[PDB]
Ligand binder design. Structure first.
Ligand SMILES: [Mg+2]
Ligand SMILES: [Mg+2]
Ligand SMILES: [Mg+2]
Length: 121
RNA sequence: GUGCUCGCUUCGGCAGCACAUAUACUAAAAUUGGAACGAUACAGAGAAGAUUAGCAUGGCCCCUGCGCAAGGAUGACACGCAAAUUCGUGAAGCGUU
């Protein structure tokens, strides 16, 4: 179940962070260029220095577009059958009756049987 | 401007001294814009059938009123394809390591 906005974030982060692959060439290049400060503390100096080249920002933009697509596929539309006896006259009435069947559907299980058998019992 | 000068010294002038010491949104204007109902056509008053009392609520909406009264159509407006972070099952067919 859902239970939190942070647990779905954590699941989504584990997915993205397992999908990524690091490049050791760029890593060792920047390590050899930066030297002493490549293992920084909270307070070293480099906060206002990095300028990423075009390939890095292109990779970030493509990854973020894929992430936006994965987010937009979150609520899949359930298929609409017209064989069920419809009990709504609007477009919002159908979804409100669906919410009523979600919440009160466990309790109001005898009266629907009474209705379908002819208002008896 | 006025007065006093044992001022020249006449009643003409001049000299000295004293008192008196800074108005005006500066126009009888040139300009510059936003504005008077109200007439012109249109336009028609909320609450799930119809006929209807209303009291609110919110603010780059005001009017009448001295009003922290009360009115203005319940003063008007508000009416919205009301979507905010973040997904997974199972088999089935096809291609692939
Ligand atoms: Mg009123
Ligand atoms: Mg009325
Ligand atoms: Mg009102």
């Amino acid at each position: 179940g859902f239970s939190d906005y942070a647990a779905a974030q954590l699941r989504q982060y584990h997915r993205l962070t397992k999908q990524i692959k690091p490049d050791m060439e760029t890593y060792e290049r920047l390590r050899e260029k930066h030297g002493e400060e490549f293992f920084p503390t909270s307070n070293s100096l480099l906060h206002g220095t990095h300028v990423p080249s075009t390939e890095e920002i292109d990779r970030m933009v493509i990854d973020l577009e894929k992430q936006i697509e994965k987010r937009d596929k979150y609520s899949r539309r359930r298929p609409y059958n017209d064989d069920a006896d419809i009990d709504y006259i609007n477009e919002r009435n159908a979804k409100f009756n669906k919410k009523a069947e979600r919440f009160y559907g466990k309790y109001t299980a005898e009266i629907k049987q009474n209705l379908e058998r002819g208002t008896a019992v």
